[PDB]
Amino acid sequence: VDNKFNKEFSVAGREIITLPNLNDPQKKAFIKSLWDDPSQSANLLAEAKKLNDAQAP
Amino acid sequence: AVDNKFNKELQNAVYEILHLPNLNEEQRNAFFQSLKDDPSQSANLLAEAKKLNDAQA
């Protein structure tokens, strides 16, 4: 089966880099994790959003 | 037998390609699929992506 996780990578990664309160190394860490195991896209995006929401001004 | 992982070059290319504001989703997916199949071509693919981003601004 082709899980189409290449497309899942693109959609989730674009969302991660538009989170305004994540710093540069945080975003890059998330992207690296997403690239390596796109099966975890939902877990990673949720962790990134919670962290972004928690780092709000 | 050198093992070229391209860890840095690939992550740089992916991260820049995700920020290019004028690419469409289909274009991003095509670049990421090509990067995953041939990681040695990260520079050529990133340069093509930047050319499209500019031509679509």
Numbering used by the authors:
A (entry chain B): 1 to 57
B (entry chain A): 0 to 56
Paper text:
We adopted the Z domain of staphylococcal protein A and its affibody binder dimer complex as a model system. We next generated libraries at the interface of a weakly associating dimer (Z+ ZSPA-1) with micromolar affinity to determine if we could affinity-mature the interface by coevolution. To clarify these inter-residue co-variations discovered from the sequence data, we determined crystal structures of 10 coevolved pairs that spanned a range of cross-reactivities and orthogonalities (5 from LL1 and 5 from LL2). From the structures, we could verify clear compensatory changes between the residues showing the most significant covariations (13A-9B / 17A-31B) in both LL1 and LL2 library mutants.
The second library, LL2, used a more diverse codon set encoding mixed amino acids (F, I, L, V, H, K, N, Q, Y, D, and E) for four randomized positions on each of the Z domain and the affibody, so that the functional diversity (1.91 × 109) of the yeast library almost reached the theoretical nucleotide diversity (4.29 × 109). All mutants except for one (LL2.c1) had a higher fraction of nonpolar BSA than the original dimer (58%), and all mutants except for one (LL2.c7) had a higher packing score (PackStat) than the original dimer (PackStat of Z/ZSPA-1 = 0.640).
